[PDB]
Design a protein around this ligand. Structure first.
Ligand SMILES: *[C@H](c1[nH]c(/C=C2\NC(=O)C(CC)=C2C)c(C)c1CCC(=O)O)c1[nH]c(C[C@H]2NC(=O)C(C)=C2[C@@H](*)C)c(C)c1CCC(=O)O
Length: 149
């Protein structure tokens, strides 16, 4: 029952990477300290795997929880041109991220986590249709989980 959650997470990451033809898609799920765990991952062969990593970034609890709960989407063509400072880039470096797309998963009016896509090693001008499909995907999976209780 509760473990059926995982089936949804696996679907989101696999479908997401297929939709975007990007290098990695993860579900990054928050605990009650807004520490995120990579609970699911679809990653093309040969790129670093983030699955099961716990990645604590205080920026979320300090700055961004409500914004994402309210539907914030961050598309980034080039992480080196996005005003992201070294303390941010340091987290993305090991995973070879160069472009990314962050969309929220909101369940029962609470920020469950984020669905995140990465393009490795090259910038990527995310398209309107790509952002819309990816955010839809996160919203759909969230609504399924919300309806299953
Ligand atoms: C907030 C922030 N961090 C992340 C992290 C990730 N992006 C990914 O792709 C992945 C998977 C590998 C992770 C994890 C995101 C998406 C955001 C939100 C960006 C936004 O919505 O604008 C954030 N963290 C930092 C680094 C900060 N954290 C630290 O531990 C230290 C030290 C830091 C130096 C300040 C920064 C700079 C941000 C954005 C600005 C901020 O909130 O301070």
């Amino acid at each position: 029952e509760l473990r059926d959650r995982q089936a949804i997470f696996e679907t989101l990451v696999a479908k997401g990477r297929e939709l975007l033809a990007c290098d990695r898609v993860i579900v990054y799920a928050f605990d009650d300290n807004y520490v995120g765990t990579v609970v699911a991952e679809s990653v093309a062969e040969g790129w670093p795997q983030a699955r099961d990593q716990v990645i604590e970034d205080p920026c979320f609890r300090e700055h961004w929880v409500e914004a994402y709960r309210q539907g914030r989407i961050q598309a980034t063509t080039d992480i080196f041109k996005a005003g992201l400072t070294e303390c941010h880039l340091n987290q993305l470096r090991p995973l070879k991220v160069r472009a990314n797309l962050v969309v929220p998963m909101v369940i029962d009016d609470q920020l469950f986590g984020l669905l995140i896509a990465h393009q490795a090693s090259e910038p990527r001008q995310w398209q309107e249709i790509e952002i819309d499909q990816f955010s839809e995907l996160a919203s759909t999976g969230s609504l399924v989980l919300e309806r299953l209780h």
